[PDB]
Amino acid sequence: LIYGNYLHLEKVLNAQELQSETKGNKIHDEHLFIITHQAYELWFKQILWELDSVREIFQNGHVRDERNMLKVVSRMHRVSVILKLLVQQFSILETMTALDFNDFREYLSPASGFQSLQFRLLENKIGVLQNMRVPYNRRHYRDNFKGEENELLLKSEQEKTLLELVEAWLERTPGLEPHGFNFWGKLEKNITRGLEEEFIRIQAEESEEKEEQVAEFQKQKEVLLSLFDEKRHEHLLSKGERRLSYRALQGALMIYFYREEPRFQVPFQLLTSLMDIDSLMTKWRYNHVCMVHRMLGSKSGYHYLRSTVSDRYKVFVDLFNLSTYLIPRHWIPKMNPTIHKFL
Amino acid sequence: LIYGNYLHLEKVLNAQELQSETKGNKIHDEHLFIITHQAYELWFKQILWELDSVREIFQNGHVRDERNMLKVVSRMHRVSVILKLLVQQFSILETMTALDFNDFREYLSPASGFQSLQFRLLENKIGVLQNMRVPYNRRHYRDNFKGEENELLLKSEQEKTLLELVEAWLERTPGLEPHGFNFWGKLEKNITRGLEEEFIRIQAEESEEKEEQVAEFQKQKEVLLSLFDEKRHEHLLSKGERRLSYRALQGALMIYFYREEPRFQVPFQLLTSLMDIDSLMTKWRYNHVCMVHRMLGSKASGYHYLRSTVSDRYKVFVDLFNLSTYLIPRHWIPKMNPTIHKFL
Amino acid sequence: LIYGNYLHLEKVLNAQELQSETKGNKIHDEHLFIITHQAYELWFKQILWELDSVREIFQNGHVRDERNMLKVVSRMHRVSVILKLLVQQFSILETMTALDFNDFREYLSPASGFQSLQFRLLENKIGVLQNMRVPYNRRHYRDNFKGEENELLLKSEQEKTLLELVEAWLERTPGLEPHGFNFWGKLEKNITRGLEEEFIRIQAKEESEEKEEQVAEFQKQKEVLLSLFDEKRHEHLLSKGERRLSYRALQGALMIYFYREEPRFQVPFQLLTSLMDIDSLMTKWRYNHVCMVHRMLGSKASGYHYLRSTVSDRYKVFVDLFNLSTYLIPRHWIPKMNPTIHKFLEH
Amino acid sequence: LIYGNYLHLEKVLNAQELQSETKGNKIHDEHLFIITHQAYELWFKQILWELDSVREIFQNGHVRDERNMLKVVSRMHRVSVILKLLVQQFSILETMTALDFNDFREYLSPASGFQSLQFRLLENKIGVLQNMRVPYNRRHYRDNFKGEENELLLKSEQEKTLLELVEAWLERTPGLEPHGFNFWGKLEKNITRGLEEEFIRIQAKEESEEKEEQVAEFQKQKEVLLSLFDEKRHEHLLSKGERRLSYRALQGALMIYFYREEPRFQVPFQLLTSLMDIDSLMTKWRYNHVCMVHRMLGSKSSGYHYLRSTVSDRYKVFVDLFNLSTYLIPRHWIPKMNPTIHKFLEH
Ligand code: HEM
Ligand code: HEM
Ligand code: HEM
Ligand code: HEM
Ligand SMILES: c1ccc2c(-c3ccc4nnn(CC5CCNCC5)c4c3)c[nH]c2c1
Ligand SMILES: c1ccc2c(-c3ccc4nnn(CC5CCNCC5)c4c3)c[nH]c2c1
Ligand SMILES: c1ccc2c(-c3ccc4nnn(CC5CCNCC5)c4c3)c[nH]c2c1
Ligand SMILES: c1ccc2c(-c3ccc4nnn(CC5CCNCC5)c4c3)c[nH]c2c1
Ligand SMILES: C[C@](N)(Cc1c[nH]c2ccccc12)C(=O)O
Ligand SMILES: C[C@](N)(Cc1c[nH]c2ccccc12)C(=O)O
Ligand SMILES: C[C@](N)(Cc1c[nH]c2ccccc12)C(=O)O
Ligand SMILES: C[C@](N)(Cc1c[nH]c2ccccc12)C(=O)O
């Protein structure tokens, strides 16, 4: 077993054909364009491999055994480390000027990055919903794909996404049981009391400060009490402005507030990594847009791509938005030894 | 064609075969090990493509037309940007623990990085000398290679290296003509006078401070005057402690000292990027070492051999680094009045 | 001269006071928040130092001596290396969770990043226009500043910006002289001829959907390229702030783009590249800042929304340099510069 | 307060005095040299703040409550994120050429990085032992310091280091109890049996060079693995400074390595990983510092050579955590921990 055979370099290093040269007009920088995309695709393959392995752990029930949490978080962390490298990798393609790109751009049609099967599979397997995607040229993204590739993309839409698998796990988070620690019941009561206490403090001296604090209080009150409005949540779900079930949201908040408790330490890291992956995917899209602009100019692909840099494409937006519902520590329902050892 | 066909993804994305799985014992992390190496090899191919294009510009005479210096420096800069990414790329393989690596390491034998043809081609084309390589297991590096691969490696050794092509260009640097700006003659004269003047000043509170300055002066004097010792240079060349001809060294120093002159601005950037490539190659080797250590331990010695590769022995453009040693006060630098400037 | 004295560490390392601790409730992560900002501010000071030195080289005429172009480009390159580090530096503040931030956030009011004098000085000196700034809570940016700080900001608004100094230099670019190489006149003629030739080819084809598509594309390309020679349209887009460089400076920039390999234009071209780099890195700084405000405060608190608005071409000072990609033409249409004239671009 | 007051910018941004300018010969790049060091020192202060807080958690017994492990690992992780930035930060000082550095270097004497209090405090608090430091010009590092600074450094040497505090915690790792899971007893037995089995396998092979090699390899691997159970060899390697951890702490570390997926060991394993990360990044810092001294001053006691000697395992405090890779065995040799005996490692 030789290095080159083990790595199948007879394939990897014989996959570089310049279209400019095939048409009798070799342009040096086309080689860079090819390699860059090939490297992205290798790493997309690796991300898919990690992500599919994690989906499997959830889907088959292995995640129920908490011994598997280290591997889950290590692999999700690994995805974010790869995505960071992929963001940095744009720095290489930025050494190609727009003038040099323009010398071989004509030979590219009818190819586009849009046709990256793996990029789509990745979006779908994380949990981008087809109905929420921004249309390209007034049409669905999958119409750009055909045959088995179209079929694979459909499977990736219909099979359970990372979002759905995490959701189901969040729904089982310990502590939500009304008969048990009764997290939600206690949280509602403590926030009500907390707000009442604050109001009383505010009620007494009249000044600019008071005027502001009253307004702030009213806004904070509206936000925090809205958390207990399950109907509003259902409505925002139907519009796609939220993604997690109400119960899963409760699970996530339980993990956030009790993160230090031993059984929640690695789960909290997992939630953190999920947000990280969303943020890095967005950064990838942002860096991609800025580079399309520098190469093709304004006037559109550019405008479509800019539209993808939105909360529409943030699958774990609900994990980000839990910051909105932070409260002072002393309002958090206490978890003393009496009710401590369940975690 | 369409994206997948244009990029020949039917090849690139069907090149992942886990030996652990071929032997009925699939280990998840083996996939990462394969992809990481495949990505390194794609970028090595790109570096070779840039470097060969630059060697060709020198070798075919195009570099003589100074309009081509922007392309030369852009491509060398591009090599450095790729190397930076390759250094950062170790962060991905560091997400594999030694315990997990140990689950599939057995299936790797007898394969090794030592068998990376492209890495060797890159070393050779930059200018690593075979006689200066540290031996591993009392073995020649090319012993690990056979067939047309061994042939390619031989060509890479025998064809002109980047070092040699840069050397030849440096030897033609304007300003060295004895009948012209006479850089070397004037520099020797100015440094001699400069040192004499300083000595006189030092000759003055008759204290240990004076003594210390005396000692420093004597050391600085020895260093600076050694620059004009062409025989010493030839001797250090024969040992491989320097690499550039004496004349090329003079060219480089001309570019260093007159870097702001318009004809030397982009040449100076080129010299800077050559040093950058040497620094980044060494950084790659160092990051590689630290990772071998974390995975195999000090015992498994590859670790120690690799530590040895982090040495000036593997720095092709060491002469460009060492020109820092011969910095002098600005006012000692032979003046280039616009009248003379005209040539630059 | 000792290290600590030379670096005035008695100042730098005695500037960390946690408000949480001043109010009898020390919160560990506040220290990180202070240091992070202090490090940003040190690097902003360094960016201002480089940028002021480069402004001065332009303003005082030193840039006319082309010996100084290496220093100009090295310092602008240095600014972009610093900005890259500043973008990476957000990775440190991302190790603070929103829950931990929430424990000391109350002690921060009424302080805000908006009160960073240096950040505003940097924006102004590069060339962000006051009239183009997006209002925050229907307020002017300078109203958050008073006394000498307000005065400094005003000077930074009134003094020549990097954009204006680069503009003036671009207007002097060799090759534009109608009596000389006559770049503009020749470019207009070559593009007109080039378009005419292309039209004839397409016209020769037989009516088809494909031919229509070619005709449509041709018509778009034609409109774009010929719009470049419409000086009045340029003046109009200037007045709206959709462009920033004078028409003549735009000509200079395109001259440098197309003739970048000519010796006198090699370092100028790198300068143009570094100016675009600085714009892109500034935007990336703003973007990374936004994403982190979101993670800490949530969708509304909107700060998030105002900051998202700052990530726009409205804040890109060198937008015109980016948009020269729009006007790329086949290489063979570029007016030739044989040695006959090339000598004017030798040095 | 206001931003500038809160961050004490009246201190931070009035700490830049160029010695070149004080002596009537301002050199532009000296400003960069000052700011770069000031930024390093801010981040050293932050690293000390995190490291001291973690030492305190160990020293005061708080680490005994496993609820605190998340905070411990987040802060050590944060130290490694800062160190990574500090490694990248050399890229800024690399935009200063040796020629430009040479224009102001004369004004620096007698200041040096050697005089960084915080850098020494950091080395000492992690656990660099004074007896293992390479001497520079045959002098102790502390001799470069006086007054309160010398006193601070003494405290840093005499107080419990991170190494010592982690050692004590590792010694208490669950599973080592002879009367309990008896990890060490079982590991010795399983490795002995494992080696016997392997010997039989190889001996069964047909006479071949491959067999001969496997024999030799086996003999080497056998010596290595069995040497682990030689506590006297360990004491000897301790004396020479080739190991740093007590024998029992090493057992704890290996317990965590092999049983990392067990819930109680998941975050402990991450801690071990972060300790190695910090050591690797400290070494990378020293390496990048060396390469830059070389680029500025040339090959030439020679600072270069002293510094090069610092880039070695003698300055890696947690070298033992790296070297546990030497003692990896097939998974199936690891003493089994069924739920029957799994209970003690469940939260
Ligand atoms: C010269 C550099 C590049 C240019 C000019 C460019 C241009 C474009 C354009 C115009 C689109 C919109 C679809 C279209 O109209 O064709 C697009 C989409 C895309 N590009 Fe790029 N691209 C570049 C580099 C890359 C690289 C390096 C990748 C790496 C895989 C990539 C991946 C994609 C993907 C996945 C899409 C679909 C994005 C989505 O729908 O959200 N591109 N690109
Ligand atoms: C698990 C990670 C790695 C380990 C344990 C490892 C181990 C080793 C060892 C022990 C050697 C010395 C030769 C030998 O004894 O076989 C070596 C050499 C080498 N490795 Fe790696 N390696 C790793 C990752 C990589 C990666 C990612 C690359 C990237 C292509 C690479 C490329 C090389 C090259 C080119 C050499 C020979 C270079 C020279 O002779 O200086 N290795 N490796
Ligand atoms: C916990 C981290 C951070 C949070 C939550 C945060 C929050 C905010 C918010 C809400 C604003 C909008 C103005 C306001 O409502 O007060 C703002 C603006 C600003 N922040 Fe931050 N910030 C953070 C970190 C930083 C850092 C590290 C810097 C670096 C110096 C910084 C510099 C600024 C600047 C300069 C502005 C004004 C920029 C503009 O108007 O476009 N902030 N920040
Ligand atoms: C122009 C750049 C630099 C040069 C030429 C340089 C030079 C040196 C030299 C020669 C030494 C050995 C002690 C001596 O003989 O004086 C040293 C040590 C040191 N430098 Fe630097 N240095 C540079 C940048 C930095 C930076 C940016 C830092 C950041 C704080 C730094 C921190 C240190 C430290 C802590 C030591 C002591 C290291 C040890 O003993 O292990 N230096 N430097
Ligand atoms: C592989 C192949 C091409 C690309 C592109 C890309 C970028 C700019 C382009 N301008 N024209 N084309 C071809 C057209 C084909 C039909 N769809 C619209 C674009 C381009 C392609 C980006 N990544 C690639 C990877
Ligand atoms: C491809 C395939 C393997 C490697 C290695 C690598 C890393 C650790 C190893 N431990 N044993 N072996 C096999 C031996 C055979 C050659 N002589 C010593 C090593 C390993 C191989 C690194 N890069 C690779 C790429
Ligand atoms: C220094 C000081 C504070 C900051 C902030 C920042 C971030 C989040 C905040 N939430 N409340 N406040 C105080 C408000 C006072 C009145 N309205 C403006 C903000 C915050 C301040 C970011 N960077 C800082 C640097
Ligand atoms: C602050 C101040 C100076 C430094 C240096 C540094 C770098 C290069 C030098 N060459 N000479 N000197 C002065 C000598 C005085 C003490 N003995 C050796 C050095 C230098 C100082 C690095 N970091 C600094 C921070
Ligand atoms: C037994 C369990 N692992 C419980 C569980 C569910 N979600 C969680 C989140 C954090 C901590 C634990 C859980 C399971 O049902 O999967
Ligand atoms: C005509 C020439 N380009 C002269 C030359 C040689 N080396 C240089 C270094 C810097 C500047 C110019 C040169 C050539 O012979 O290549
Ligand atoms: C003499 C001159 N340096 C000419 C000049 C102006 N802009 C340029 C751009 C590229 C090259 C040269 C110039 C000056 O007027 O500054
Ligand atoms: C009660 C305990 N936290 C036990 C302990 C010690 N070291 C460990 C390593 C991993 C897991 C647990 C421990 C303590 O004694 O600190």
Q: HEC string of D151-203?
A: HHHHHHHHCCCHHHHHHHHHHCCCCCCCCCCCHHHHHHHHHHHHHHHHHHHHH
Specify the ligand 9 atom closest to the Cα of A169: 7
C12 close to D40: Cβ distance less than 8 angstroms = no
Q: Residue whose CA is closest, atom 1 of ligand 12?
A: D64
Q: Do B324 and D287 touch (CB under 8 A)?
A: no
- Would residue C89 count as lying in a domain? yes
For residue B335, tell me if it sits in a domain.
yes
Tell me the C-alpha distance between D77 and D69, whole Å.
12
Burial class from Cβ neighbours inside 10 Å (0-12, 13-18, 19+) for residue D135 reads: exposed
Provide long-range contacts, Cβ within 8 A and 24+ apart, for B10-13. B11/A11, B11/A12, B11/A14, B11/A15, B12/A11, B12/A12, B12/A15, B12/A38, B12/A41, B12/A42, B12/B38, B13/A41, B13/A42, B13/A45, B13/A118
Q: Is residue C214 situated within a structural domain?
A: no
Residue C129 in any domain: the answer is yes
What does the DSSP assignment read for A212-280? HHHHHHHHHHHHHHHTT-HHHHHHHHHHTS--S-HHHHHHHHHHHHTTTSHHHHHHHHHHHHHHHHHHH
Rounded distance, CA B83 to CA B279, Å?
10
Which residue of D lies nearest to C34 if distances are taken between CA atoms? D7
Q: What span, in angstroms and rounded, lies between the C-alpha atoms of D143 and A199?
A: 61
Which is nearest to B245 in space by CA: B153, B325, B140, B165?
B165
CB of B317 closer than 8 Å to CB of B161: no
Instruction: Answer whether residue C326 is part of any domain.
Output: yes
| Exposure letters A38-61 (e unless 16+ CB within 10 A, then b) | bbbbbbbbbbbbbbeebbebbeee
The dihedral of CA B15, B20, B22, B24: what is its sign? negative
Tokens found for residue A260: 């230090």
Contact of C75 with chain B, judged by CB distance below 8 Å, is answered with no
* Residue appearing with tokens 């034609």: C222
- In this structure, what CATH number is given to the domain that contains residue C246? 1.20.58.480
Cβ–Cβ < 8 Å for B86, A91: no
Residue B195 lies in a domain: no
DSSP D26: -
Residue A1: nearest ligand to its CA? 6
Report chain B's C-alpha Rg in angstroms. 25
- The ligand placed nearest to the CA atom of residue B294 is 2
Residues in chain A: 343
**Contact assessment for residue B278 and residue B197, using Cβ atoms and an 8 Å cutoff:** no
Ligand 12 atom closest to the CA of D65, numbered from 1: 3
Task: State which of A3, A7, A8 you would mutate to test the pocket of ligand 6, scoring each by most atoms of that ligand within 8 A of its C-beta.
Answer: A3
> Rounded distance, CA D234 to CA D232, Å?
5
Indicate the DSSP class of residue C95.
T
- Nearest Cα residue in chain A from B112: A3
D174 Ramachandran zone, left/alpha/beta (phi>0; psi -120 to 50): beta
Q: Helices (DSSP H) in chain C: which residue ranges?
A: 3-6, 9-12, 19-22, 30-59, 69-88, 90-93, 98-101, 117-126, 147-158, 162-171, 183-204, 209-227, 231-240, 247-258, 263-297, 303-310, 319-323, 339-342
What is the number of other CB atoms lying within 10 angstroms of the CB of residue D90?
A: 17
C-alpha span between B97 and D325 (Å, rounded): 10
- Residue A136, SS3 per DSSP: strand
Q: B97: which 2 tokens?
A: 């623990």
A19 falls within a domain: yes
Q: How many CA atoms lie within 13 A of D171 on its CB side?
A: 11
For A62, residues 6+ apart whose C-beta sits below 8 A from its C-beta are A56, A68
Tokens representing C191 are: 């593009």
Q: Looking up tokens 């044989």, which residue turns up? A: C338
User: C138 CA distance to ligand 3 centroid (A)?
Assistant: 18
C-alpha to C-alpha distance for A295 and A285, rounded to whole angstroms: 15
Q: Is B98 in the pocket of ligand 6 (CB under 6 A)?
A: no
Residue B200 lies in a domain: no
**What's the rounded Cα separation, in Å, for the pair A31 and B48?**
11
Contact indicator for A191, A223 with CB cutoff of 8 Å? no
Give binding residues of B for heme as ranges: 288
Work out how many domains chain A is built from and give that number: 1
User: Does residue B152 contact residue B146 with C-beta atoms inside 8 Å?
Assistant: no
Asked if D28's CB is within 8 angstroms of C53's CB, the reply is yes
- Is B322 within 8 Å of D298 when comparing Cβ atoms? yes
Residue of D257, D276, D325 with shortest CB distance to B296: D325
Q: For residue A310, which of A340, A278, A267 has the smallest C-alpha distance?
A: A278
The Cβ-side half-sphere exposure at A295, using a 13 Å CA radius, reads 20
Q: Which residues pair with B136 in a beta bridge?
A: B139
Does the CA dihedral B289-B291-B293-B297 come out positive or negative? negative
* Residue numbers of the domain that contains A172: 3-177+240-339
- Longest Cα–Cα distance of chain C, Å, equals 85
AA letter at A121: L
B71 touches chain C (CB under 8 A): yes
First to last CA, chain C: 45
**Residues facing residue A139 across a β-bridge:** A136
- A288 neighbors C265 (Cβ within 8 angstroms): no
| Pocket probe mutation, ligand 11, options C64, C67, C246, C267, max atoms within 8 Å of Cβ | C64
Method: X-ray
The amino acid present at A18, given as its one-letter code, is L
* Sequence-ordered alpha helix ranges (H) in C60-146: 69-88, 90-93, 98-101, 117-126
Any ligand 3 atom below 6 A from CB of C32: no
Residues 6+ apart with CB under 8 A from C172: C252
User: D 83-112 residues with CB below 8 A of C?
Assistant: 84-85, 88-89, 91-92, 95, 108-112
Three-state DSSP state, C280 = helix
Q: What is the DSSP string of B224-262?
A: HHHTT-HHHHHHHHHHTS--S-HHHHHHHHHHHHTTTSH
Neighbours of C204 (CB within 10 A): 8
- Which of A35, B300, C73 is CA-nearest to residue D328? B300
D284 Cα to chain B: minimum distance (Å): 9
